Structure 1
Amino acid sequence: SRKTYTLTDYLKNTYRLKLYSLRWISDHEYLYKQENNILVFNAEYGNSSVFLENSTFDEFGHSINDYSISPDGQFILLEYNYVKQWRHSYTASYDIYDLNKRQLITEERIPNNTQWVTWSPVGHKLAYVWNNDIYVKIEPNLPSYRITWTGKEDIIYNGITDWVYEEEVFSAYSALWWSPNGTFLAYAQFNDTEVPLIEYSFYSDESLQYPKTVRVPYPKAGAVNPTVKFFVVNTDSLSSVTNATSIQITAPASMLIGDHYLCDVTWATQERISLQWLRRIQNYSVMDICDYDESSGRWNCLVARQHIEMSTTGWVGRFRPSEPHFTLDGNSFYKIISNEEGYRHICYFQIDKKDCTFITKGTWEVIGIEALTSDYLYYISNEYKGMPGGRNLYKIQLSDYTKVTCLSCELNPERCQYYSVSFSKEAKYYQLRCSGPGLPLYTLHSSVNDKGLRVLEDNSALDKMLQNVQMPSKKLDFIILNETKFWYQMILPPHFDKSKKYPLLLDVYAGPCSQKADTVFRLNWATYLASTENIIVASFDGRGSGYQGDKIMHAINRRLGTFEVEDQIEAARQFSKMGFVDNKRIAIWGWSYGGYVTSMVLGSGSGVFKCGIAVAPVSRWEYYDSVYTERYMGLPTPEDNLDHYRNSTVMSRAENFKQVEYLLIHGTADDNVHFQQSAQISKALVDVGVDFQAMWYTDEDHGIASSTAHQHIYTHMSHFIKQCFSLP
């Protein structure tokens, strides 16, 4: 009976989680920002010298957005004038500071408006992208060599991804890859010549008299995609009297007979590079393994060494083919592939032998491979307790596959069931991040004996303040439909009394391979809704969700907008059954795919929901980008899946919105889910004569993430939900 977690608490960020972001630099040391002084810590003993002080750049003259230290400690890269583009891309200006000579490098600098910069993985070589071309600097103070000359704004991209490659395939702006010791620089080249443009108004400061039209090469579903090429250049034989020789590695022939994507590049040795390609119909992929050829000076990709990967029940990978991890000599590698029972497990490959050996099996999936030593492989899985929403670090003995030790399950089972890990340069040490269900807990460990060295952060600061407030609780459980379990989670109000009728808000994402029912600790809008408004905020992972094998995941293949929406409605019904839910007060809300599902649900006239909110929803699949959409729906042609594209829009369900209160919200400068989508919904609802609520956000994009917009939307949503539930 103290204060509750209020809307303002969330919005103003009064209760803050501490983190412990460290960047390893050797096998023995790491860096950490402390009161703006980057410090170097000794993994073993824990002592720390100051590496650089908040002082050093008092009079830089510019506000410093980020730093990045050369792998050999000698120089430090300074990032300023940060201007965001899409989710990962941005441009900045850069300056290099010599640490020996305590000075800034004044001549032959990095241009203003640089799109990407990266060090070589050892030493202090530099590669950067400027007006879509790649440049290399051997020494920070020396003149840079030009690698490509073809770069052209919104047409040719060298070393950086276009829109759809950034967002849907690499999850990165960067499209260049150094070889381990820095000899080679590989890069992708993207030709967007015939990719159609999305165009939308941007309004800017009210001083701007005419609105700007932003235009972006963006392939909607079934439209014309970019084409890609791959090159490797030798930075050691750069001339300054000759243009650099870039060596192309063509796609596999099987890929060349139609549209495809380059979807993974991973160096294997100093002279071996592995590449993964994927057909536009994303159920067939091929891996190439290429060796440097001394006498030719090109890259030989032995077809004997190819490895085909495909799926009959859906698409390849969770979102794309998994990345390989090679052994030091690079003759074999481990990779997560789905077994024949449909479960994602670690497989073991020989460069030239065509099959592989699973080194794990079970009714659970490997989340990712984390580290590879000479006789141990470390990975994260959801095996422990057989709960998919959990997350734990395991290690397996390379010389004996039965010897599997769980490195985190036992460490604190009550507080910690969701871990991630960050290893040191050779895995002498590792840092565990526990993120639920208790308050996050960062610790350090040495791999040699798996000894827990010390506690890095434990959020006891926050723990104090939090017993001062009536927090909500989280139940993670499952229900059974057709004797398979489907997990749900519920944020329950403080003093939850199971005999009363609570109003319930269904929190939905439901996208392919999504997981909204997990054991993470979160301070968010739902916390406020439970704590202050006594609303149960529930999420449910139905068909289509991940981490439970392909029978659940691929269940929506080619059939988006069906099973995942019906299972959501079902879950609602089940919650009524549970008894502590007010029947006549169930709501639903979600963002992106979440908004689509919300809308599809509200549109189905199942009468289960009183109302919902869709934020930046997809409304019909022909509008979303090709790489994502087609991965699940294939092509919107009559020979393929046009029928289901058309059978699955929100607008056809417009009529049924007559039975629900609806809130449509969408940022006008949304480059991802275009405003178009919401605009099509409103139109549909107007036409069939349905009242609803609406909200645009001028110049906000898909994040609606700008400070004041963020507060404004949640505020507007809160009022909506309260009035919908008749709370005061």
Structure 2
Amino acid sequence: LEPFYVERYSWSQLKKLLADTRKAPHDFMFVKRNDPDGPHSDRIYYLAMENTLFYSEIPKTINRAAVLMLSWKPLLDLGIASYDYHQGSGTFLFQAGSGIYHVKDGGPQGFTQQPLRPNLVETSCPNIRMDPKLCPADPDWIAFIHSNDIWISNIVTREERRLTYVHNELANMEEDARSAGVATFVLQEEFDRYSGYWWCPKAETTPSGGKILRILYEENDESEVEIIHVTSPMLETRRADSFRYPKTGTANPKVTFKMSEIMIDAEGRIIDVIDKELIQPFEILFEGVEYIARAGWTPEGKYAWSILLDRSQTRLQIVLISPELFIPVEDDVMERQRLIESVPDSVTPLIIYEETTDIWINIHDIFHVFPQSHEEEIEFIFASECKTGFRHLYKITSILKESKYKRSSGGLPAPSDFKCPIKEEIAITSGEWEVLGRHGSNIQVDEVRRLVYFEGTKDSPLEHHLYVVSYVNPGEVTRLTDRGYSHSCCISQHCDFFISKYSNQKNPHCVSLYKLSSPEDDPTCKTKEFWATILDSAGPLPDYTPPEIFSFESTTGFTLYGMLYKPHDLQPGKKYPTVLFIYGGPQVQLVNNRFKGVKYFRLNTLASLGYVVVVIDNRGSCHRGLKFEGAFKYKMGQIEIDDQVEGLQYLASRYDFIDLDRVGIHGWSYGGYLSLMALMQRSDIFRVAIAGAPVTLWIFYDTGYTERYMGHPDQNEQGYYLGSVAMQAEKFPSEPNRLLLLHGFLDENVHFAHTSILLSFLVRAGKPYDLQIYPQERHSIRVPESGEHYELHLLHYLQENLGSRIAALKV
């Protein structure tokens, strides 16, 4: 064998090649036409290219010889991120820039043929308005956030009112702290729980003959949370912004629950508002809870629910919270004494389902609730990894029992006093595969036919196929998407059509509309049909040779998957240099059968310079159950590279053109962390390491993430020590050219402190580094000029220290 060498370009010549070589539809919704005679069945509304609202028409019959391309009809007159709806009126609502707008299409006021004009919601608010949500009960009321407080605005009467008076926007950060109706830093980053207020879909009637609308919300008080100083984006000022960051082992925000009551008289104006806190403290009612993972209302509207975790995140609880638990707020001490006794004892919180595990609770969106079937029962579907070790739907019926705790007593509650008995727990699915419940995946639930649809890993972990099965008497799981592709699917609310954003490794991404059929003898059975196309493909894209997906049976008893990009125009005899992209952290799988030319376009660019690009999903990656993910608990850093080195040596034996005297590693966030761990642990295997936003020291990262995977720092001092590359600075090479550090100077998530503190110890260890800073970038890179420079320095750094003979000369 004789080593291949890559093109020694200049700096500007590399900028040439990048500069030269150069979003999908989403948020679908279905509305049927109520059309006695006419042709079209449905009219859908969705978001795509500024990025705004489109609509389309679904024909009742198609010429099955030809392929129907559906038309992108524009819904608006002239981006848009997330919209709301109310079918009973047709009332839309959405955000675009600072302003909020509304139209009508479907309901009592017709189907518009042409693009209807966007009518604005006017305001008496001094600041930007965030997170607009429609009330289902009243189609005319909406709610939104303004300076960490909830307002409501009426888009016909033009009547506005501030509901929560918590955040004093004139007072500064250090003294203020509180919020009401927004999620904190942790709950948005680590739990994808972006909103913090939820409308009630019903309204109680008053003695005057009107209604009372309801809004649930949490009240965070971040007073004990650590203040941290990130540098301000305007480097001109030479100042830093103070923002709250609950570091591992420190206090999280003082969470507690609240609820509103808006009396609307017969005319439609607000009578009088009542703001309501809990009957007792959050510590006493919900004992040992330290996070509010999700919340919302029952379709009934009688109970408001919330999923609640303990601090270590090893105890999920689903609790029902009836509005009769809340009382109005009062400064008068003995008036509240009277308010508490008038509320009964039997009106009590109800833990309808508790579960534990010695790994962790992965929080998911899936929680369908059925209408109140029997009197003191609640039928509901829920997902859980706890039982089998894999996420499966369990139909549960919990007895809504009167509590053994009476607050009148004076005594304090025991741990089991709000635990409901279980009538049943029917496992709807089962196996060595999971149901998906994050990133827009959930469950479409037919209640007449009594079915349930879902995404999962049944056919393969590499493909996210659509599946269907009954919830009453469950059994066989019917696949609804063609093999070889991966699918992020959306089913109709009427269960007759479904749309499937799909791609694979060779062919780019598309979208397709599909019709579901069902024999009239048997509701259970369902078959699909290729109905239409919403977006045609980009074809075998020019200059793009993808990687062939490989798997290998690991020495740890797992089928570890991987992507292998081979050098474009392959030379037998001449072995090539090798580069290894990586993330290998929780909540993320890189290797699946999907088009990796969109986001991972550069990997292909490296393949067309003579770099062997390899990618592996080590133990810890998602979509493969709790036991596979759970491998690294308390042991982040320690195992991951050994899986990568193993999977690399499978490619080394099979394909000997991979030169293991020229091995490079690169990644972002956790990816950069492992890239440092690679060079630190395996100096012998790995030549160069390029660390993007490296987590160098786990005591600096937030609670929500780190306590989940590593526990509380005090009870795992070694796991933190071993998992923190900053401590182990002496273990790095005494050889330059092998350690590049890349980091955004304004990083809120993986603080630049990680890099600076690592560098501090690297300096006193006497260890060389190379370093680039992108001073205008936060966590990722969200500016063209920075991104251009990153890629430009990446390819040149590899060229100068891995690929070409000048790099071979440096040793």
The normalised TM-score by structure 2 is 0.77
Per the alignment, residue 229 of structure 1 pairs with 256
Q: Give the whole-Å Cα distance in 1 for the aligned partners of 2:124 and 2:104.
A: 13
Q: Give the whole-Å Cα distance in 2 for the aligned partners of 1:561 and 1:480.
A: 19
Per the alignment, residue 426 of structure 2 pairs with 357
Per the alignment, residue 179 of structure 1 pairs with 200
Q: Give the whole-Å Cα distance in 2 for the aligned partners of 1:586 and 1:290.
A: 56
Which of 565, 586, 591 matches 1:517? Answer: 591
Q: Which amino acid aligns with 2:29?
A: W
Q: Give the whole-Å Cα distance in 2 for the aligned partners of 1:142 and 1:361.
A: 52
Structure of larger gyration radius: 2
Q: Which amino acid aligns with 1:19?
A: A
Q: Give the whole-Å Cα distance in 2 for the aligned partners of 1:196 and 1:564.
A: 31
Per the alignment, residue 540 of structure 1 pairs with 616
Q: Give the whole-Å Cα distance in 2 for the aligned partners of 1:679 and 1:499.
A: 44
**Is 1:29 matched with 2:43?**
yes
Q: Which amino acid aligns with 2:468?
A: K
Contact 1:108–1:141 (8 Å) recurs in 2: no
* 376 and 249 in structure 1: CA distance in 2 versus 1, 3 angstrom threshold: farther
Q: Give the whole-Å Cα distance in 1 for the aligned partners of 2:182 and 2:20.
A: 35
Which of 122, 126, 132 matches 2:148? Answer: 132
Q: Give the whole-Å Cα distance in 2 for the aligned partners of 1:97 and 1:298.
A: 44
Per the alignment, residue 478 of structure 1 pairs with 552
Per the alignment, residue 397 of structure 1 pairs with 470
* 246 and 689 in structure 1: CA distance in 2 versus 1, 3 angstrom threshold: same
**Is 1:316 matched with 2:361?**
yes
Q: CA deviation at 1:181?
A: 5.2
**SS of aligned partner of 1:651:** coil
Q: CA deviation at 1:293?
A: 4.8
Contact 1:31–1:41 (8 Å) recurs in 2: yes
**Is 1:429 matched with 2:445?**
no
Which of 691, 696, 711 matches 2:788? Answer: 711
Q: Give the whole-Å Cα distance in 2 for the aligned partners of 1:440 and 1:246.
A: 49
Greater displacement, 6-15 / 336-345:
6-15
Q: Give the whole-Å Cα distance in 1 for the aligned partners of 2:192 and 2:128.
A: 22
Q: CA deviation at 1:433?
A: 1.3
**Is 1:165 matched with 2:181?**
no
* 488 and 78 in structure 1: CA distance in 2 versus 1, 3 angstrom threshold: closer
**SS of aligned partner of 2:249:** coil
* 690 and 488 in structure 1: CA distance in 2 versus 1, 3 angstrom threshold: same
Q: Give the whole-Å Cα distance in 2 for the aligned partners of 1:103 and 1:548.
A: 45
Per the alignment, residue 753 of structure 2 pairs with 676
Which of 375, 379, 393 matches 1:332? Answer: 379
Q: Give the whole-Å Cα distance in 2 for the aligned partners of 1:571 and 1:106.
A: 56
Q: Give the whole-Å Cα distance in 2 for the aligned partners of 1:175 and 1:10.
A: 46
**SS of aligned partner of 1:680:** helix
Provide the alpha-carbon RMSD of the alignment. Answer: 3.4
Which of 162, 170, 180 matches 1:146? Answer: 162
Map residues 412-423 of structure 1 onto 2, 5 A cutoff: 413-414=483-484, 416=485, 418-423=486-491
**SS of aligned partner of 2:354:** strand
Render the CA deviation track for 1:67-124: whole Å, top value 9, x for unaligned: 84653566665645x4xxxxxxxxx344557898968458545653223222234624
Q: Give the whole-Å Cα distance in 1 for the aligned partners of 2:784 and 2:345.
A: 49
**SS of aligned partner of 2:220:** strand
* 372 and 14 in structure 1: CA distance in 2 versus 1, 3 angstrom threshold: farther
Contact 2:582–2:665 (8 Å) recurs in 1: yes
Map residues 87-126 of structure 1 onto 2, 5 A cutoff: 92-94=98-100, 104=119, 108=123, 111-121=126-136, 123-126=139-142
Q: CA deviation at 1:625?
A: 0.7
Render the CA deviation track for 1:371-399: whole Å, top value 9, x for unaligned: 11121111111111xx3222111000234
Q: CA deviation at 1:484?
A: 2.6
Q: Give the whole-Å Cα distance in 2 for the aligned partners of 1:659 and 1:572.
A: 25
Contact 1:587–1:609 (8 Å) recurs in 2: yes
Q: CA deviation at 1:203?
A: 4.8
**SS of aligned partner of 1:128:** strand
**SS of aligned partner of 2:627:** helix
Per the alignment, residue 194 of structure 1 pairs with 224
**Is 1:262 matched with 2:292?**
yes
Render the CA deviation track for 1:334-390: whole Å, top value 9, x for unaligned: 222125442222212113242522222222222234211121111111111xx3222
Count of residue correspondences: 685
Q: Give the whole-Å Cα distance in 2 for the aligned partners of 1:129 and 1:12.
A: 41
Contact 2:673–2:696 (8 Å) recurs in 1: yes
Q: Give the whole-Å Cα distance in 1 for the aligned partners of 2:303 and 2:615.
A: 45
**SS of aligned partner of 2:256:** strand
Contact 1:24–1:31 (8 Å) recurs in 2: yes
Per the alignment, residue 440 of structure 1 pairs with 509
The share of aligned pairs that are identical, in percent, is 23
Contact 1:476–1:517 (8 Å) recurs in 2: no
Q: CA deviation at 1:38?
A: 4.6
Per the alignment, residue 43 of structure 1 pairs with 58
Q: Give the whole-Å Cα distance in 2 for the aligned partners of 1:35 and 1:262.
A: 35
**SS of aligned partner of 2:596:** coil
Per the alignment, residue 36 of structure 2 pairs with none
Contact 1:378–1:394 (8 Å) recurs in 2: yes
Which of 306, 312, 324 matches 1:281? Answer: 312
Contact 2:515–2:531 (8 Å) recurs in 1: no
The normalised TM-score by structure 1 is 0.85
Q: CA deviation at 1:326?
A: 1.6
Q: Which amino acid aligns with 1:271?
A: K
Q: CA deviation at 1:24?
A: 1.1
Per the alignment, residue 531 of structure 2 pairs with 454
Contact 2:503–2:510 (8 Å) recurs in 1: yes
* 534 and 395 in structure 1: CA distance in 2 versus 1, 3 angstrom threshold: same
Which of 743, 763, 779 matches 1:702? Answer: 779
Which of 562, 567, 570 matches 2:646? Answer: 570
Contact 2:498–2:515 (8 Å) recurs in 1: yes
Residue ranges of structure 2 left out of the alignment (5+ in a row): 1-6, 8-12, 33-41, 61-67, 110-115, 204-212, 327-341, 400-420, 519-526, 806-811
Q: Which amino acid aligns with 2:562?
A: Y
Map residues 562-711 of structure 1 onto 2, 5 A cutoff: 562-578=638-654, 579-637=656-714, 640-658=715-733, 661-711=738-788
**Is 1:508 matched with 2:508?**
no
Q: Give the whole-Å Cα distance in 2 for the aligned partners of 1:397 and 1:8.
A: 56
Contact 1:293–1:300 (8 Å) recurs in 2: no
Contact 1:476–1:487 (8 Å) recurs in 2: yes
Q: Give the whole-Å Cα distance in 2 for the aligned partners of 1:325 and 1:629.
A: 29
Per the alignment, residue 85 of structure 1 pairs with none
Q: Which amino acid aligns with 2:278?
A: Q
Which of 321, 331, 336 matches 1:290? Answer: 321
Q: CA deviation at 1:669?
A: 0.5
Q: Give the whole-Å Cα distance in 1 for the aligned partners of 2:777 and 2:477.
A: 48
Per the alignment, residue 60 of structure 1 pairs with none
Contact 1:445–1:451 (8 Å) recurs in 2: yes
Render the CA deviation track for 1:486-540: whole Å, top value 9, x for unaligned: 2222223335567652322111111124322211112224433444212222121
**Is 1:204 matched with 2:234?**
yes
**Is 1:348 matched with 2:353?**
no
Q: Give the whole-Å Cα distance in 2 for the aligned partners of 1:648 and 1:34.
A: 42
**SS of aligned partner of 2:674:** helix
Q: Which amino acid aligns with 1:213?
A: A
Q: Give the whole-Å Cα distance in 2 for the aligned partners of 1:436 and 1:487.
A: 15
**SS of aligned partner of 1:725:** helix
Q: Give the whole-Å Cα distance in 1 for the aligned partners of 2:101 and 2:558.
A: 57
Render the CA deviation track for 1:611-631: whole Å, top value 9, x for unaligned: 010010101100001110111
Structure with higher strand content: 1
Q: Give the whole-Å Cα distance in 2 for the aligned partners of 1:31 and 1:421.
A: 15
Greater displacement, 342-351 / 218-227:
342-351
Q: CA deviation at 1:245?
A: 2.8
Q: Give the whole-Å Cα distance in 1 for the aligned partners of 2:157 and 2:801.
A: 63
**SS of aligned partner of 1:131:** coil
